[PDB]
């Protein structure tokens, strides 16, 4: 039990898939000339 909760706390081999993150900071588009379902969720006034 002690070992298993440590493994749940610290999953060594379970988590790391490939370690291949691109690391660039993601950019959000705020323009209001294109109509899309995702933009409508974040942009309210129409």
């Amino acid at each position: 039990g002690i070992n298993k909760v440590l493994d749940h706390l610290a999953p060594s081999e379970l988590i790391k898939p490939v370690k291949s993150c691109h690391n660039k900071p993601s950019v959000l588009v705020l323009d209001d000339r294109i109509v899309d379902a995702a933009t409508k969720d974040l942009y309210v006034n129409g």
Partner: protein, 117 residues
């Protein structure tokens, strides 16, 4: 972190075997997760920053209990924490980029002071 730090300071320089073995098991378990930005998520990133703090504490505490002995496995663990920067680079708006690099370089500085101690 708090429990092991009190534990390490309590058995300071007196040396022991069970405490050393427990910390060896703990550091072996906690070492692979260290400085792994796999899925760049703020919740995950904060938790693994706490992991970096926790692994810094375990190495320092393990060194504290086994001070002045020149042990092998403690040296083995502290050598590994010392070498290999890891992090986002390698393998495992200008001021804004400056702050982004500053956060990572400060993380490396914090990781280095612990292993040097």
């Amino acid at each position: 972190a708090g429990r092991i730090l009190a534990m390490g300071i309590r058995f300071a320089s007196t040396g022991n075997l069970k405490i050393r073995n427990i910390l060896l098991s703990l550091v072996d378990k906690f070492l692979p997760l260290y400085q792994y930005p796999g899925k760049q998520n703020l919740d995950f990133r904060l938790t693994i920053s706490v992991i970096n703090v926790l692994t810094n504490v375990i190495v320092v505490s393990l060194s504290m209990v086994m001070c002045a002995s020149g042990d092998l496995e403690v040296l083995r663990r502290v050598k590994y924490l010392h070498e290999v920067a890891s992090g986002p680079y390698s393998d495992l708006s200008d001021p804004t980029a400056y702050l982004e690099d500053k956060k990572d370089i400060d993380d490396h500085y914090g990781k280095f002071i612990s292993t040097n101690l």
